[PDB]
Design a protein around this nucleic acid. Structure first.
Ligand SMILES: [Ba+2]
Ligand SMILES: [Ba+2]
Length: 804
RNA sequence: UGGAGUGUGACAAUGGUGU
RNA sequence: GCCAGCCGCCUGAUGGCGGCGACACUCCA
């Protein structure tokens, strides 16, 4: 096994900044708690009614089994007590009746002593005496902290939602925003923390289906529809209730929870039922109030006044762009807004009154955790030309105005293939676009010497490969093909398949709307991409400002795996790995593979890293003495696996390059998907309307691991909403990095992303790896080895950053 | 397909089981 | 334990081919 190195030091670089984090300190006793296992018969029940069963079991066998003890329940098979039960260590069988009268099911439950979970061991791990934190104890504490919320609120994953209080938040036809919160127990130095963040989703309004139709079909009242429903109205009302659940209410106090299927075009009166309207006057004595609305077909092969909408449905449906817009009005709050909302939620949830967390002697603080962060100094960015301009990122941003590329490509043979309609993308557009692009190019030190040698329209994907062939054969020295497109078109994937994998020709696509009208910003970022695609070097980190790691040859790797949505039989997951090819580091080379459907481990990593090392040795004439590996998208539970496989893969790739070649490996996992938020304590340190922490804000205390080498770094400037600081976890480090050195290196690498002049949220290696997987997915658009070949890039473009 | 960011979306950590 | 969801297009759900590895919003010289 490979265990991650401990935190080497605590880091002191940068200017300090006071922060608050959405972690609330917990007070955890040092006594042991007791874990029992449950099995409820039958097992054809939702998780909610298993919780009701267990609650009635605790209330019924109070004097026999439990007593004053108030246990907690996972929902499936895990019960926990703060005191041992009198049942001993052997299984016990109990009979639990379920109340309701209209339906009374009998359940056979079995309680069995499993284990004695030690909170003292948890405290030992929180101090660092024990190196690794017990996951099972963390799970027990979690179950304890979400026992009551799982029953008083609506559970959705690790979040809980409710219907506000009074004034709802109307969304659209039959929906409304529910506000909720994610909750999770996390370990940290000396103390457990309760991590709380706010969230929202969409639920169906618990209204009678009449109101449903009124809001779906825009009726001031139901008396509006004094005629039968029209063609488009039936299908409209169908697409909104095709699978929802309704409650038949023509019954007494007794209710129903029958699901829904389709909608008829027969208004009850005119539907032969071997009519329906007739059926409701004789079977039950209920004259229909609206015998002109349609019926709700059920299941697979009823009036709208008899049905209601079953409260609590989560609306798994997709939302209208206007419901998405109102959702973002409600959810993407400024950082102070979200801070205040989390604090208010924690002040109202009253965890220090939950009888179950108090049964276990736990207390939760009401205030966010104070964290002393550090704003790291941003690197200076060296540009080119007679000026040799230096750019200083200011709040994570700089501009290329009055600056020229470090090394700018002279473009002197290029073509234009316009797959947009000539009627819409006229020749005046092409002329003025060329003029403006050339002006911006010359301004940036990437001059385009003369008009395009070739400039023609075309249509259809079938035209792509022939044309390019012609272009490659009839125009010598062809550097670039600009491909104007009319929007999302199958022509794009074909352009990339031909230019990247078949012929090895560099292409730059551009949307019609950016040729008809140009702006300096769009043309400039496009020039960035064009330059690096022709081998340019837009800029480099100021050489002297870099950490000491650059005093010897070093290669930086970025790796990512993209998966398809669940359900696809094969749709192989795409693994991409990129590697730096110079000391700057600016140029990166890519490798990609298809592998088992939804597998996170990069199976063929050894071969890919071998390719990258070979290219590095060829380009620099030296072998790296250090390998810095940035690995994206790995969960805690996958650490052991991925580390064991991929560390060994890298070592193999090394020794396959040379017998005794053992460079030091730094394996770092990059994670953006978490629920950690950081807020400025001083209103003066807030940046740009959103009110976020400054770019470069770093945290490696109070919410990080108690013993291991992890840290939050927010390297980007937040625009709208609350910034998501990237989290970094060092799974392996032969090179004995200091906290400061590694944090600074990560930050500086975040300024080497060629596609834009701003510090981005993750290091350029990782971002490039994502881009490479994206392009690979595009290359598969038209057998396993067939796919593996289709995703193989031509040898001439492999030399370039075609994925920019 | 100029580009970055953050909201929703991952049904492994979830959810169904009288016309 | 058995089961898996949503949206399109065609035959007009008795099937078949595609998406949800995205959409949305904010913001740049
Ligand atoms: Ba089950
Ligand atoms: Ba990933």
């Amino acid at each position: 096994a490979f265990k991650p190195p401990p935190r080497p030091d605590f880091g002191t670089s940068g200017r300090t900044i006071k922060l608050q984090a959405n972690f609330f300190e917990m007070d955890i006793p040092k006594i042991d708690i007791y874990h029992y296992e449950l099995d409820i018969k039958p097992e054809k029940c939702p998780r909610r009614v298993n919780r009701e069963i267990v609650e009635h079991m605790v209330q019924h066998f109070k004097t026999q089994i439990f007593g004053d003890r108030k246990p907690v329940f996972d929902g499936r098979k895990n019960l926990y007590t703060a005191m041992p039960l009198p049942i001993g260590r052997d299984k016990v069988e109990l009979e639990v009746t379920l109340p309701g009268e209209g339906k009374d099911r009998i359940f056979k439950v079995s309680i069995k002593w499993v284990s004695c979970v030690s909170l003292q061991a948890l405290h030992d791990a929180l101090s660092g005496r024990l190196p690794s934190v017990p996951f099972e104890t963390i799970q027990a504490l979690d179950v304890v902290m979400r026992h009551l919320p799982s029953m008083r609120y609506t559970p959705v994953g690790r979040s809980f939602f409710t219907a506000s209080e009074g004034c709802s938040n109307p969304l659209g036809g039959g929906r409304e925003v529910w506000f909720g919160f994610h909750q999770s127990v996390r370990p940290s130095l000396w103390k457990m923390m309760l991590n709380i963040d706010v969230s929202a989703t969409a639920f169906y309004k618990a209204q009678p289906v009449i109101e449903f139709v009124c809001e779906v079909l825009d009726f001031k009242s139901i008396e509006e529809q004094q005629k039968p429903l029209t063609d488009s109205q039936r299908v409209k009302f169908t697409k909104e209730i095709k699978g929802l659940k309704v409650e038949i209410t023509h019954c007494g106090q007794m209710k129903r929870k029958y699901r829904v299927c389709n909608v008829t075009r027969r208004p009850a009166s005119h539907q032969t039922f071997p009519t329906v309207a007739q059926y409701f006057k004789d079977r039950h004595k209920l004259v229909l109030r609206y015998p002109h609305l349609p019926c709700l077909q059920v299941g697979q092969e009823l009036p709208l006044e008899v049905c209601n909408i079953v409260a609590g449905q989560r609306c798994i449906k997709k939302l209208t762009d206007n419901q998405t817009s109102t959702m973002i009005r409600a959810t993407a709050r400024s950082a102070p807004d979200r801070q205040e909302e989390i604090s208010k939620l924690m002040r109202s949830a009253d965890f220090n009154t939950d009888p179950y967390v108090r049964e276990f002697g736990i207390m939760v603080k009401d205030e966010m955790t104070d964290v002393t962060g550090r704003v790291l100094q941003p690197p200076s960015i060296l540009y080119g030309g007679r000026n040799k301009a230096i750019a200083t990122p200011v709040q994570g941003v700089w501009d290329m105005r009055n600056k020229q590329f470090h090394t700018g490509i002279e473009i002197k043979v290029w073509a234009i293939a316009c797959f947009a309609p000539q009627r819409q993308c006229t020749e005046v557009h092409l002329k003025s676009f060329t003029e403006q692009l050339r002006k911006i190019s010359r301004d940036a030190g990437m001059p385009i010497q003369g008009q395009p040698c070739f400039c023609k329209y075309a249509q259809g994907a079938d035209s792509v490969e022939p044309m390019f062939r012609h272009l490659k054969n009839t125009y010598a020295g062809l550097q670039l093909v600009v491909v104007i497109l009319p929007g999302k078109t199958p022509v794009y994937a074909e352009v990339k398949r031909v230019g990247d994998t078949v012929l090895g020709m560099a292409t730059q696509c551009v949307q019609m709307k950016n040729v008809q009208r140009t702006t300096p910003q769009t043309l400039s970022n496009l020039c960035l991409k064009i330059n690096v695609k022709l081998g340019g070097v837009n800029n480099i980190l100021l050489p002297q400002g870099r950490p000491p790691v650059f005093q010897q040859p070093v290669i930086f790797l970025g790796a990512d795996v993209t998966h398809p949505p669940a359900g696809d039989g094969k749709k192989p997951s795409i693994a991409a790995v990129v590697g730096s090819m110079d000391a700057h580091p600016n140029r990166y080379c890519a490798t990609v593979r298809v592998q088992q459907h939804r597998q996170e481990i990069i199976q063929d990593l050894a071969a890919m890293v071998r390719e990258l090392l070979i290219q590095f040795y060829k380009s620099t004439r030296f072998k790296p003495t250090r390998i810095i590996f940035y690995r994206d998208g790995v969960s805690e539970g996958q650490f052991q696996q991925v580390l064991h496989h991929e560390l060994l893969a890298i070592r193999e790739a090394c020794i396959k390059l040379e017998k005794d070649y053992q460079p030091g490996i730094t394996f770092i996992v990059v994670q953006k998907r978490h629920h950690t938020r950081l807020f400025c304590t001083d209103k003066n340190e807030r940046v740009g309307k959103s009110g976020n922490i400054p770019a470069g804000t770093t945290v490696d205390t109070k919410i990080t691991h108690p013993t291991e080498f992890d840290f939050y770094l927010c390297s980007h400037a937040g625009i709208q909403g609350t910034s998501r600081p990237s989290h970094y976890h060092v799974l392996w480090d032969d090179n004995r990095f200091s906290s400061d050195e590694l944090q600074i290196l990560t930050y500086q690498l975040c300024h080497t992303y060629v596609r834009c002049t701003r510090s981005v949220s993750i290091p350029a290696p990782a971002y490039y790896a994502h881009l490479v997987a994206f392009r690979a997915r595009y290359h598969l658009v038209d057998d396993h080895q067939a796919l593996a070949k289709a995703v193989q890039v031509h040898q001439d473009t492999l030399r370039t950053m075609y994925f920019a």
